[PDB]
Design a protein around this ligand. Structure first.
Ligand code: CLA
Ligand code: CLA
Ligand code: CLA
Ligand code: CLA
Ligand code: CLA
Ligand code: CLA
Ligand code: CLA
Ligand SMILES: CCCCCCCCCCCCCCCC(=O)OC[C@H](CO[C@@H]1O[C@H](CS(=O)(=O)O)[C@@H](O)[C@H](O)[C@H]1O)OC(=O)CCCCCCCCCCCCCCC
Ligand SMILES: CCCCCCCCCCCCCCCC(=O)OC[C@H](COP(=O)(O)OC[C@@H](O)CO)OC(=O)CCCCCCCCCCCCCCC
Ligand SMILES: CC1=CCCC(C)(C)[C@H]1/C=C/C(C)=C/C=C/C(C)=C/C=C/C=C(C)/C=C/C=C(C)/C=C/C1=C(C)CCCC1(C)C
Ligand SMILES: CC1=C(C/C=C(\C)CCC[C@H](C)CCC[C@H](C)CCCC(C)C)C(=O)c2ccccc2C1=O
Ligand code: SF4
Lengths: 147, 80, 160, 92, 137, 741, 42
């Protein structure tokens, strides 16, 4: 009753299940930046990087080698920036290797689309890491986790 | 792809053709054996290399041999 | 004497004997006299003493560690250490091999050799077992009559 | 609301309310055991919530009856919620 | 030729079906006529119900198609199964009963491919075919 | 209708087929053209499903094989009882259980092996035993070698009865398939009769024999002075002295005035202070309650009189929107396939063995078993191993059912079909969780090792550093500690003192004390989870992909146990459900080895020990576990290197046998790698050369020598691997614990 | 005795077990009556 063939195609390697094809799942996925409609590949990358650097700052800040030091937050931000640069390099090499120069009009599956996406991701990631750094440095709650 | 070859020791038993999970081997006409038929490998690009043909062969060393060569999607049996 | 000292006059050997006997006596001190444990430990002590005395009188050579060493070079003064035991082995092993080969041929010339090999014909097997006592002359007779070694052209071989 | 590709699901919150009441009202059954105090499961849970809200930032200590009461009450509540959804959607 | 309007054996769906490689490279199909509605085993996993009449099925591998065909031939007594290969261009090809008759029985018209005029013992040595274009046959 | 129907004289008892090996199989009856026939004979000896297509014949064979197994087990028990009666120091152990080491085996003085007859105690020297039979007998109330002789006689008589029953029910009166396919009747009778009446009879025995005898023994009365069980049975006054409620009679029972029996039927909990084991008065009530429960449970199913259930109806009624047809067809599957039943029963039996190991150490049930540390360790590890093997066998027979007895026509859109149809999701998710657990459980140990080796000891995952506290387990322990009087009001003590409480000490030695969980315990528990999950991954992946996969669409045709499908498709080695069982057995060995090592170290470091006059307990290793068990170096040094001293310095002692077995098990484990790392072609070519050597002397076997099949080589490698590893651990554990306990 | 039972006794594993048990007994009794013989006495 609840589990059915995917797209009414019994022979595709997929099943239509509540987790996979429910109304909430479809709405959530279609509203995420990777799928939302209208966003340029640059804006998708901007939102995703903003979201990702923000949470990247935390683990380094609270569990890095210099976590019991005065410079724990700055060290965490600088490690976040390093990891962001590494991942931006990963994105760039993936884009140059996977997508050939044919122009499909910035669909995020093109050379230009992926270049814009990785540029936006780098910018947004660095910005989000900086924003998290500012908030942690200025708010005691975030420095103590509520202690 | 893999190179499948047949030799004159073939007796036309056809078990090599019947054992192939793909359709790589077929029986053709011949005069060198009592059965009057010999195995042939026209669709060698579909061969996977399982050597089931080799297993289903009754002649002292095989009349059919599979030499594993370059690998492709079909040879590797990759459904993805 | 070759490079070592006789074991009958070695302080190390005597010390090892004393240590073994003292261990056994310490184990015995905690058991009532005449009880099975006491009798067993006393018999162990007697066996240890007899073994050490016999090793001493055997002419065995003992090193600094206090343990007998074997001179397996061919010296006739130490034949009993490796050569005569080795001769006894070779005798028994050739017996076994000769009778096994004879039974293999016997089963080869049967109606069902495989059946004769999994379910044996123990009368014939015992016959061959008995035959095995003159295997050296029998084996040499087979060799000279040419029934032992097969020709190079009659043995299967892989291609080069 | 579609629970799957094309299957609709009501998702009635009155089922949730009914299951909550069905588990909680029996939970009022008092017991004089130290864990409950003298009260029932639901009342003990409310009392613990208030007591540990009065001391807000310090979690109920390990060994406090709060954790056991919470676990038992929520196990029963979830069981009743599953059963009530089953009844409303299959036997409804 | 292949008719893409043949119904399918009312399968309930599985995760063993074809994937993006089927849409990108190659997608095989098998068509067969059934005298009644039986239950058969999908080569990908699970049970399916074949229809009374013509049934068309899509798979990712020729081996899967031929395994299904062998199941039909042996388990059931269906031997009119035809196998095709479809490219994204839509260029359906015909493969299994290539000459309308199964390869296990000789048929006039076939040309021997890959046949050698000696036993395996007559193959040349790699030393003899080294730095040359000769073949070990 | 549930009724009895048998065939009379179906098979004639004759030795004709004893001389025809392979008679059961058509391919083997022909004869041994090669040595592979010899191995096939044994590999297919008990595969009754491949000998014939007759379910009736298979069921009859299984019934008679079960009778033979029961006869063998009864012979085993009679042997143990007879050895206890004749070659044991049981009387001395009864006189002073805390001073003399139990022993029931004696070796002959042939080549100096008499050293193995160590000074166990009580004027007796033999081989110390770690099976707990002495404690079993003490709990049962045995106080003489005469009673043990009678026990051995009863065991021998039952073995004879069982063998006769097997022969009779194969050759004289063989029940039919209709008789066999009575699931309702077979469960009613098992539950009520077998289990319920067994625990009822054991409760009666405990109430009339074990309880007073053990009461006097704990009071200190001599075993010779204690009266006899029939004296207790017939002298209600004598029993009314020890348990004053027997003067009341059975009127309280039949009037439901059950409180009158509180003296000998009590919910007390804890451990007997004198013996260190569970209260036998608690065990009697436990078994009586179990008898009531089982006899009630055995009245659930319909046999002949309308009242009852039908499992077919229950299963077919249980279905939901996520499962389509639900449990439809499972009743037919389980009453038509022995392999499905074997898989279920093996899985449950193995899990039961594991549960039994856990519960039998935290709540020592027998008198003077808790302070017999060798017995506790040996029993725990033994039952853990049996459980692991049973689970792997359950996987194997699930695969065998899937390949052989699975029919898609009868399984359409039911639970089995739906599992097969989404097997990819299950295996992918289990793969991800296995990788995640492996990382976050073993990379923690690697991190700790690296930090300790770099001197950053403050960056480790330790109680003195970043902490991983099992707060949930500690919370459960607190609950169980406080339950007596609060959530179990009528229980005087906690179920186990491991959860918390006071130390139980017998003979100035800890019987059971609280077990504290910290960071090391958190890590080792998550490693247990990792290993279990990986084992499940291997076994379940094999079972689900037994019939077909994207790689081999026709695998059921190849079978349940085939070597490969050739070097094609990139290589299809070990693709069958048999090879899945093979790898999963390797991983079960890994899992159980880690579990038993955890038990050994934790119990020697934080539970077991000697209690001083100060009331303080010094443990065997002394808290090594908390700060050493957090690094692989800590395990290598403080557990393996440290505790292997007892076994490697055992030469010249009564544990010299343990040292020799240590070395031999190492040898066998290494010898397995020859089969595991190698292939058949090399050995067949070597055999070709050896056969040339034999032919040069005009002789060679008519049964052509052949290298082991690929599957047989894998099986030999696995068997030797498991034997060597388990034997190494066996010698190590027994030597260490017998030296320090 | 039944000829089939005798053939079953003649089967390879039974004969191997009996023969090797006999050989083990021979060696064991030799070591029991003449123990600790590390050498041929000369
Ligand atoms: C690795 C080389 C080597 C080899 C192959 C041998 C071989 C031999 N040594 Mg040895 N030996 C060696 C090194 C070696 N030795 C070394 C390095 C030393 C010094 C440490 C010795 C010191 C040594 C001594 C002192 C003696 C031997 C003797 C012997 C012979 C004993 C059997 C015999 O005499 O049969 C003879 C019997 C027959 C030919 C037939 C017997 C027929 C019936 C069955 C009786 C044998 C040929 C003994 C001997 O007499 O050698 C000539 C001997 O007395 N060796
Ligand atoms: C108690 C001590 C002891 C024990 C337990 C063993 C055990 C063994 N020995 Mg023996 N051996 C011993 C003492 C011992 N040996 C001594 C003291 C010597 C020195 C003489 C030898 C010399 C010896 C040899 C030379 C050989 C063995 C072999 C063996 C193994 C196989 C035997 C066999 O299959 O027989 C059953 C018999 C047969 C299968 C028939 C064929 C093989 C025998 C040995 C032929 C005998 C006659 C032949 C003409 C001798 C020519 C020897 C020359 C080429 C050097 C077996 C593990 C064999 C081995 O390891 O093979 C790989 C082997 O060839 N042993
Ligand atoms: C825990 C609470 C609980 C329980 C035990 C049940 C039990 C039952 N309900 Mg349900 N029901 C519940 C809560 C519960 N209900 C709630 C909260 C609602 C409101 C949404 C409903 C609304 C409802 C309706 C409208 C109907 C039922 C009916 C049923 C029966 C259907 C079968 C079933 O559920 O098998 C479960 C039964 C077992 C014995 C399983 C035992 C498992 C143990 C605990 C482990 C059964 C007697 C039907 C009925 O009347 O049937 C006669 C029916 O028509 N229920
Ligand atoms: C089924 C389990 C079992 C096991 C593993 C053993 C094991 C043993 N028994 Mg046996 N035994 C058993 C059942 C068992 N017994 C039963 C059911 C009885 C009652 C009849 C006996 C009665 C018995 C006696 C009377 C003796 C043994 C002895 C022995 C030991 C030496 C046996 C031997 O070398 O025989 C080798 C025999 C061959 C023919 C080979 C050995 C530890 C002996 C012992 O421990 O002596 C110190 C001994 O004297 N057992
Ligand atoms: C071949 C495997 C094997 C071997 C060699 C042993 C060996 C041993 N077991 Mg056993 N055991 C095994 C498998 C095995 N077990 C399995 C698979 C289980 C799980 C069912 C058990 C459960 C078990 C228990 C619970 C106990 C032993 C004990 C023992 C030791 C004493 C032997 C004895 O006579 O106990 C006699 C056994 C008893 C007096 C206790 C019986 C109580 C159980 C609960 C009865 C269950 C019976 C029932 C019909 C089984 C089916 C249940 C199912 C339908 C759910 C000995 C080391 C005893 C021990 O450790 O003593 C110190 C012990 O108490 N074992
Ligand atoms: C199958 C088990 C079993 C058996 C064979 C017996 C047998 C007996 N019981 Mg019973 N008894 C049992 C279980 C059993 N009891 C249990 C489980 C309990 C606990 C409720 C009792 C409690 C009990 C009492 C209190 C008394 C007996 C007594 C008796 C005797 C007279 C009836 C007889 C020897 C009477 C007697 O004489 O005991 C010595 C007696 O007074 N039994
Ligand atoms: C209730 C228990 C039970 C039962 C009734 C069966 C029944 C069966 N199993 Mg088994 N199985 C079990 C438990 C059980 N299994 C367990 C626990 C496992 C996990 C290891 C397996 C794993 C398993 C597999 C993987 C397979 C079977 C197969 C079979 C079938 C044929 C077995 C055969 O011919 O053996 C005959 C007996 C032997 C071959 C002897 C094997 C013993 C080895 C060599 C080790 C013995 C060592 C011993 C303990 C001594 C060590 C000490 C040393 C010093 C000597 C049969 C239906 C086979 C099947 O169905 O194939 C189609 C099959 O492939 N089983
Ligand atoms: C301490 C005790 C040891 C000292 C005792 C000495 C007695 C040894 C007896 C050996 C014996 O009887 O050999 C019996 C064998 C029979 O062999 C058999 O001879 C057969 C033919 S026939 O018997 O020779 O006619 C032949 O076919 C067969 O293969 C072969 O095995 O006799 C011979 O074949 C040749 C004997 C050697 C003659 C020279 C010996 C000189 C001394
Ligand atoms: C037990 C835990 C159950 C998880 C909820 C699952 C739940 O209770 O579902 C139960 C749900 C109820 O199904 P129906 O009501 O259709 O079936 C009732 C049955 O009795 C008849 O078959 O069945 C499914 O949808 C199965 C889905 C398994 C879901 C797979 C994910 C879980 C895998 C296991 C990993 C769990 C880790 C959890 C932490
Ligand atoms: C799934 C689930 C279950 C239980 C409940 C629960 C809530 C936990 C839920 C999970 C929730 C989760 C995982 C939430 C995670 C939220 C995250 C990661 C939020 C991230 C927010 C990011 C933010 C603001 C970033 C702000 C960045 C800014 C301005 C950057 C500004 C800048 C940029 C981009 C470039 C130039 C410089 C400048 C101007 C500074
Ligand atoms: C060593 C080895 C061999 C050669 C080993 C063979 C042929 C075993 C033959 C051993 C004899 C016949 C057994 C009898 C002697 C033993 C000492 C007794 C113990 C065995 C019984 C208990 C069964 C293989 O054939 C092989 C095949 C496939 C993978 C790995 C291997 C492999 O590793
Ligand atoms: S099997 Fe070998 S012989 Fe028989 S047909 Fe195929 S090739 Fe010719």
């Amino acid at each position: 009753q609840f589990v059915k063939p995917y797209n009414d195609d019994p022979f595709v390697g997929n099943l239509a299940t509540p987790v996979s094809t429910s109304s909430f799942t479809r709405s959530f996925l279609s509203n995420l930046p990777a799928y939302r409609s209208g966003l340029s590949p640059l804006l998708r990358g901007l939102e995703i990087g903003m979201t990702h650097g923000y949470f990247l700052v935390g683990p380094f800040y609270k569990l890095g080698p210099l976590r019991n030091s005065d410079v724990a937050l700055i060290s965490g931000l600088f490690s976040s920036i390093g990891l962001i640069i590494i991942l931006a390099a990963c994105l760039a090499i993936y884009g140059v290797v996977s997508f050939n120069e044919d122009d499909n009009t910035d669909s995020l599956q093109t050379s230009r689309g992926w270049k814009q996406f990785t540029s936006g991701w780098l910018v947004g990631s660095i910005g989000g890491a900086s924003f998290a750094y500012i908030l942690i440095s200025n708010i005691v709650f975030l420095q103590t986790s509520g202690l | 792809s893999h190179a499948v070859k047949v030799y004159d020791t073939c007796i036309g038993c056809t078990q090599c053709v019947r054992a192939c999970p793909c359709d790589v081997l077929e029986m053709v006409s011949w005069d060198g054996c009592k059965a009057g038929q010999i195995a042939s490998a026209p669709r060698t690009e579909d061969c996977i290399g399982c050597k089931r043909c080799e297993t289903a062969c009754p002649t002292d060393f095989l009349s059919v041999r599979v030499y594993l060569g370059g690998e492709t999607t079909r040879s590797m049996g990759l459904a993805y | 004497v070759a490079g070592l000292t006789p074991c009958k006059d070695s302080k190390d050997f005597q010390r090892r004997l004393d240590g073994s006997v003292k261990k056994l006596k310490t184990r015995l001190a905690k058991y009532e006299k005449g009880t099975p444990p006491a009798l067993a430990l006393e018999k162990q002590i007697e066996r240890t003493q007899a073994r050490f005395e016999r090793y001493g009188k055997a002419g065995l050579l003992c090193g600094t560690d206090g343990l007998p060493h074997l001179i397996t070079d061919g010296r006739w003064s130490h034949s009993g250490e490796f050569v005569i035991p080795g001769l006894f082995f070779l005798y028994i092993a050739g017996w076994i091999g000769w009778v096994g080969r004879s039974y293999v041929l016997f089963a080869r010339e049967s109606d069902k050799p495989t059946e004769k090999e999994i379910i044996l014909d123990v009368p014939a097997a015992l016959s061959f077992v008995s035959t095995g006592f003159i295997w050296p002359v029998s084996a040499f007779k087979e060799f000279t009559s040419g029934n032992l070694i097969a020709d190079e052209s009659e043995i299967t071989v892989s291609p080069r | 609301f579609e629970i799957s590709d094309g299957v609709e699901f009501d998702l009635n919150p009155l089922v949730l309310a009914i299951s909550f009441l069905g588990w909680s009202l029996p939970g009022l059954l008092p017991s004089n055991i130290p864990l409950y105090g003298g009260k029932g499961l639901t009342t003990a849970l409310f009392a613990e919530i208030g007591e540990h809200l009065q001391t807000f930032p310090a979690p109920p200590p390990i060994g406090d009856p709060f954790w056991v009461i919470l676990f038992i009450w929520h196990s029963g509540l979830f069981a009743t919620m599953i059963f009530g959804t089953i009844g409303y959607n299959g036997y409804g | 030729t292949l008719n893409l309007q043949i119904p399918s054996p009312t399968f309930e769906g599985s995760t063993g079906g074809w994937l993006r490689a089927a849409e990108v490279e190659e997608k095989y199909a098998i068509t067969w006529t059934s005298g009644k509605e039986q239950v058969f085993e999908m080569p990908t996993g699970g049970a399916a119900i074949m229809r009374k009449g013509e049934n068309l099925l899509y798979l990712a591998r020729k081996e899967q198609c031929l395994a299904l065909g062998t199941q039909l031939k042996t388990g059931f007594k269906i031997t009119d199964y035809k196998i095709y290969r479809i490219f994204p261009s839509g260029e359906v090809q015909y493969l299994h009963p290539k000459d309308g008759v199964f390869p296990e029985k000789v048929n006039a018209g076939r040309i021997g491919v890959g046949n050698v005029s000696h036993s395996i013992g007559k193959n040349l040595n790699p030393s003899q075919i080294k730095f040359t274009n000769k073949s070990f046959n | 209708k549930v009724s009895i129907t048998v065939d009379k004289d179906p098979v004639a008892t004759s030795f004709e087929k004893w001389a025809q090996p392979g008679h059961f199989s058509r391919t083997l009856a022909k004869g041994p053209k090669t040595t592979t026939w010899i191995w096939n004979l044994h590999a297919d000896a008990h595969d009754f499903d491949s000998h014939t297509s007759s379910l009736e014949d298979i069921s009859r064979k299984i019934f008679s094989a079960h009778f033979g197994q029961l006869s063998i087990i009864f012979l085993w028990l009679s042997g143990m009882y007879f050895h206890g009666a004749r070659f044991s120091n049981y009387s001395a152990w009864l006189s002073n259980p805390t001073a003399v080491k139990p022993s029931a085996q004696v070796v002959w003085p042939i080549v100096g092996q008499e050293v193995l007859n160590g000074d166990v105690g009580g004027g007796f020297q033999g081989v110390q035993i770690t099976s707990g039979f002495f404690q079993i007998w003490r709990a049962s109330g045995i106080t003489s070698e005469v009673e043990l002789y009678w026990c051995a006689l009863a065991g021998l008589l039952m073995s004879g009865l069982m063998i006769f029953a097997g022969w009779f029910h194969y050759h004289k009166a063989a029940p039919k398939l209709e008789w066999f396919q009575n699931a309702e009747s077979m469960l009613n009778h098992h539950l009520s009769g077998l289990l319920g009446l067994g625990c009822l009879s054991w409760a009666g025995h405990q109430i009339h024999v074990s309880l007073p005898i053990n009461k006097l023994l704990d009071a200190g009365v001599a075993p010779q002075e204690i009266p006899l069980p029939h004296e207790f049975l017939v002298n209600r006054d004598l029993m009314a002295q020890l348990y004053p409620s027997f003067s009341k009679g059975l009127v309280p029972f039949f009037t439901l005035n059950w409180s009158e029996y509180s003296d000998f039927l009590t919910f007390k909990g804890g451990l007997n202070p004198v013996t260190g084991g569970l209260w036998l008065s608690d065990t009697a009530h436990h078994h009586l309650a179990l008898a009531v429960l089982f006899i009630v449970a055995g009245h659930m199913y319909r046999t002949n009189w309308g009242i009852g259930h039908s499992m077919k109806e229950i299963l077919e009624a249980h279905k939901g929107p996520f499962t389509g047809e639900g449990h439809k067809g499972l009743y037919e599957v389980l009453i038509t396939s022995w392999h499905a039943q074997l898989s279920i029963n093996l899985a449950m039996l193995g899990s039961l063995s594991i549960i039994i190991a856990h519960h039998m150490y935290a709540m020592p049930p027998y008198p003077y078993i808790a302070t017999d540390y060798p017995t506790q360790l040996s029993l725990f590890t033994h039952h853990m191993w049996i459980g692991g093997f049973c689970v792997c066998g359950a996987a194997a027979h699930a695969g065998i059912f899937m390949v052989r007895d699975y029919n898609p026509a009868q399984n359409y859109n039911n639970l089995l079909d739906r599992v097969i149809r989404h097997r990819d999701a299950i295996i992918s998710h289990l793969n991800w969780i296995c990788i995640f657990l492996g990382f976050h459980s073993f990379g923690l140990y690697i991190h700790n090792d690296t930090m300790r080796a770099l001197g950053r000891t403050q960056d480790m995952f330790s109680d003195t550093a970043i902490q991983l506290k099992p707060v949930f387990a500690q919370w459960v322990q607190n609950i169980h500690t406080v339950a007596p009087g609060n959530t179990t009001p009528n229980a005087l003590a906690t179920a186990s003192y491991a959860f918390g409480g006071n130390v139980v000490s017998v003979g100035n030695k800890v019987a059971m004390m609280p077990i504290s969980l910290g960071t090391a315990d958190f890590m080792v528990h998550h490693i247990h989870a990792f290993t279990i999950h990986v084992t499940v991954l291997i076994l379940l992946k094999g079972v689900l992909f037994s019939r077909n996969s994207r790689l081999i669409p026709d695998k059921a045709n190849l079978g349940f146990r085939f070597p490969c499908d050739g070097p094609g498709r990139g290589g299809t080695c070990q693709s069958s459900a048999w090879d899945s069982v093979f790898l999963g057995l390797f991983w079960m060995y890994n899992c159980i080895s880690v579990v038993i090592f955890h038990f050994s170290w934790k119990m020697q470091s934080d539970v077991w020990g000697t209690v001083q006059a100060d009331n303080t307990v010094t443990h065997i290793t002394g808290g090594n576990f908390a700060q050493s068990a957090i690094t692989i170096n800590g395990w290598l040094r403080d557990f393996l290197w440290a505790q292997a001293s007892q076994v490697i310095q055992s030469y010249g002692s009564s544990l010299s046998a343990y040292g020799l077995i240590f070395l031999g098990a190492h040898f066998i484990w290494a010898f397995s790698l020859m089969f595991l790392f190698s292939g058949r072609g090399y050995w067949q070519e070597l055999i070709e050369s050896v056969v040339w050597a034999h032919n040069k002397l005009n002789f060679a076997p008519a049964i052509q020598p052949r290298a082991l099949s690929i599957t047989q080589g894998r099986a030999v490698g696995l068997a030797h691997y498991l034997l060597g590893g388990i034997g190494t651990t066996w010698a190590f554990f027994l030597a260490r614990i017998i030296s320090v306990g | 005795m039944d000829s089939n039972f005798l053939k079953y006794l003649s089967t390879a594993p039974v004969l191997l077990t009996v023969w090797l048990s006999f050989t083990a007994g021979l060696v064991i009794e030799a070591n029991r009556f003449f123990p600790d013989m590390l050498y041929f006495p000369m």
